Amino acid sequence: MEEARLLVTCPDRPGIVAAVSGFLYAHGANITDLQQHSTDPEGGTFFMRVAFTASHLDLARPALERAFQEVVASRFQMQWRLAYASERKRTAILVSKPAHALLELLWRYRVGELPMELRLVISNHPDHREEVERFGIPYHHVPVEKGRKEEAEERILALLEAEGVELVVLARYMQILSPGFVERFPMRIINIHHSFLPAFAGADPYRQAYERGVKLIGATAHYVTEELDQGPIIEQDVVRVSHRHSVREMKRLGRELERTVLARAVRWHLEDRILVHENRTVVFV
Amino acid sequence: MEEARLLVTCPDRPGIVAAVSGFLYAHGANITDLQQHSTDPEGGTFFMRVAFTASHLDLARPALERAFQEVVASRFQMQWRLAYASERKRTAILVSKPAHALLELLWRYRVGELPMELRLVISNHPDHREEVERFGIPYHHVPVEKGRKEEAEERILALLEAEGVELVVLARYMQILSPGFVERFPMRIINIHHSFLPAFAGADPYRQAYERGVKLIGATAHYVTEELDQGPIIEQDVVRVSHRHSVREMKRLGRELERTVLARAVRWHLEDRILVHENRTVVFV
């Protein structure tokens, strides 16, 4: 069967669920999943993901959209999107030196545990061409020269635009992205990075965490923003470490943690379970 | 504010959520929480817990019930219940020799983390009278004599009936309950017990688990049934153990695990998040 997903965010008022479930009912659909959240009882914002089925979710789609928009969307000033499971989001993976993130994604993709359409892997290094190509996926090596940054980014954009990339995944890509680039992929660029307690801003954090004697290693997957501030956090987790682990053993623990947290975030983004509002997310698991 | 909770279970058909959220909307309520589950897309059974607020949830209650029953309940052959947070379920704790379960409950109750009204603690032993009374709660020691079982149970029932006990919690009560007794507390008697992998039916399981070299200890909180088969499982969890732990150390791990799992189940039952159907539960966390 075909599963349609209705993602909705709007100002919190009474009757949104009644309106939506009621609209869907009149169009002969059957809710298979319904979740909602309100940042505040009265006032604030409303969030809802509704997964459902219905006969002929084909040419019956543009019409389903027109009606929802006229009948419900406009009434509640809703921000929404109707997504179908059969749809496979054209994605791209940018990567630099580290390969733990990329590999987990490629493999999880290969055994069919990530519902996407991986179009290509872009890297400012050649290191992974062999492994990536063995998966039947285009590997594009486009160097990132000093000052010649704009040089590189132009190619990358053309590349993604040519392929119709809807999602860009930074699998430990070590180069910064100008606000202009990020501007073309709003809440469409997922990134991963190391976290700690307390936070460790410096050179070789995995040496500073060990130096402070931390008992935890964190990792944070988030949406990338032009904004001066880190984008909407998607997922966060930690791996326990003890006096036992050496800078060598912590790094391995942190990678396993990173590739896991990142895949989790990508899987969620692909299953359409992430709703963004302001600089936070509402993840409907 | 006052929080009202609508628990509903019925045969799965399209339009239940539309009907319920729509009814609540017309009665000027605001959904603060909505969760639902369907055992099967088409066919099967429907479950839903709706927490909400509204002005004057007082004398506006019996009327809210009449309408829901005439307008929604009868239409969908629903099994339902309207519960209020201000309501404090009159409960009772039966206990025998072990005290880990009872203590966790008493304390969690004392620091206000269990929304109930503990009326009394019944025991077929005297062991805990001192601790229980220090909490300002009646301790009733009613022996359970050989063959004179019916003798004991009569007192216990009279006791609970006199107090208006709505929930009975077996905090490691070591005596069996005749089907007649259980018959007066349908899905109102929560119990806790040890679990393993593989299961260990015998004398001194905590010696057989250690003897088999298990790496896990389990505990299961469930509703008690006259039925020959263990009642609806509410919650289940495990605690990891290694070659290191001795029968002495496993027992301590299993108790900490039991009192935790049991309190969790009681807290859920009290917050009205447990829906029973057949011999399973749908817990809305």
Added chain:
Amino acid sequence: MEEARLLVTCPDRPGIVAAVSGFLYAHGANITDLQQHSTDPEGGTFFMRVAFTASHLDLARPALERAFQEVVASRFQMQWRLAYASERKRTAILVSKPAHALLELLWRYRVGELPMELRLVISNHPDHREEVERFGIPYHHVPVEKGRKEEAEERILALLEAEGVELVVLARYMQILSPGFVERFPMRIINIHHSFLPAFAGADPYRQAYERGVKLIGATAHYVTEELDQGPIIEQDVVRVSHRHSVREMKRLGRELERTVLARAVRWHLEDRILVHENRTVVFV
């Protein structure tokens, strides 16, 4: 640098650690990891794993082994072993229809997370030939015909001998192994399989479970033994399930659980961290 590992098991006696470490000291070795365990304070059996490095673990090895046998071993009646990290254990993987456990092993092996030397994969089905050989590993299909089981085992055994397999992993191999077969691999056959709370013995476990309303799913890896009883358990773990997950998604989590649990017991074995005594194990992680 070469990491030597000393695994020792013997009747618990005072002074075993003194004798073992004193010996290693005299031989100019430095202990990098030391772990011990005693089943009982008085009497019982002692277990210990000592990882150390030393100048010239070259042909200095045989002498190291002779000296330990004479000076410490015979004296304490210990069953021991001295392994070298660089000795990648020649292993084989048996598999039937299900591929989740096989794939995990293959990928973790390729990414270097499993220190072994995969020599071959054997199956009573041809299904996985393409994928396994894509990893550069020989695929040998040996059907298992009712009545002709005898003939199958002999071939399987010929292949393992010709390859000098030291470890046999059953990644969800669905065919029974005769005691005659197992007798040839004392504590050298690791198997994986389902587990539930309560347990289940029938057709469709992930069915009788969804049926009982369990909140957990268990997986158990263990060495295989000739006798009736299941062999020493190596690792056990769980995955939380609920009302949300379906009978389908319950099987998916069960696979991801098994694959992780089995790969873990394999790595611990390959890393020489498992000691067996009776029908239980000591795992020094």
Added chain:
Amino acid sequence: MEEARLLVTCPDRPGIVAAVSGFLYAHGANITDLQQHSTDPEGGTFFMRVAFTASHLDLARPALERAFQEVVASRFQMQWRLAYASERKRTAILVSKPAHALLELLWRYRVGELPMELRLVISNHPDHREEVERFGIPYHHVPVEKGRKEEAEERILALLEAEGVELVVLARYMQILSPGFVERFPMRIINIHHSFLPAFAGADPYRQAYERGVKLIGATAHYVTEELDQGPIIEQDVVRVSHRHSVREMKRLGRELERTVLARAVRWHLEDRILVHENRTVVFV
């Protein structure tokens, strides 16, 4: 039976385990637990905890201590300690407005899960007098007036001295302690407090967090030091949060996290499982 614990720390050298265990053996002791650690393979510092029992740990103790000092200690330049389980450490608890951390300590102490000898509770508020004294523990209220902080510390110190406090626990004590105060309790003051990913420095942490859309909350227990920097971390842990939880329920989970995390570091300390070297700790659990 009396369990003796030998905590040792010294410049990593070959033969330390040989010398320590050989010594204990000669003195007729039996090792029940042995754990060691080396920060670096070559050079660095060695850490070790040995739990053992022995015939007549009576006045045989001073001799045991003399002999170890002469034969092993001075030789390896080790900072060591020999603790006896029966020596219940005299401890004190400081607390301000928040009571969650205090209550947990009090209850776990009463139920016997914290091997210590609570001598007193001191607060710059009178709020908890009734509850603390209900546990049979003296309550001493010492206000902290701006400008009169000096006068407060002196009294607090007089109370601790008169009681012979060996361990000072800060169960969310909201007042600053002068270096002069801390200097009197080298590695003897355990404190607890919030932590986030990313961290937060302002008014209302559980506000700036709900603000950033974090999915975790952290708590860190650690010894207090005179210097600017936070002292050696003892334990760290987390609690997952989401969109579901509110700013209210985020504080509730944060309390339950802190109380558990602090009580854990306290028990490990009381059980002599913490060794400090520089600004980090080694925790042998």
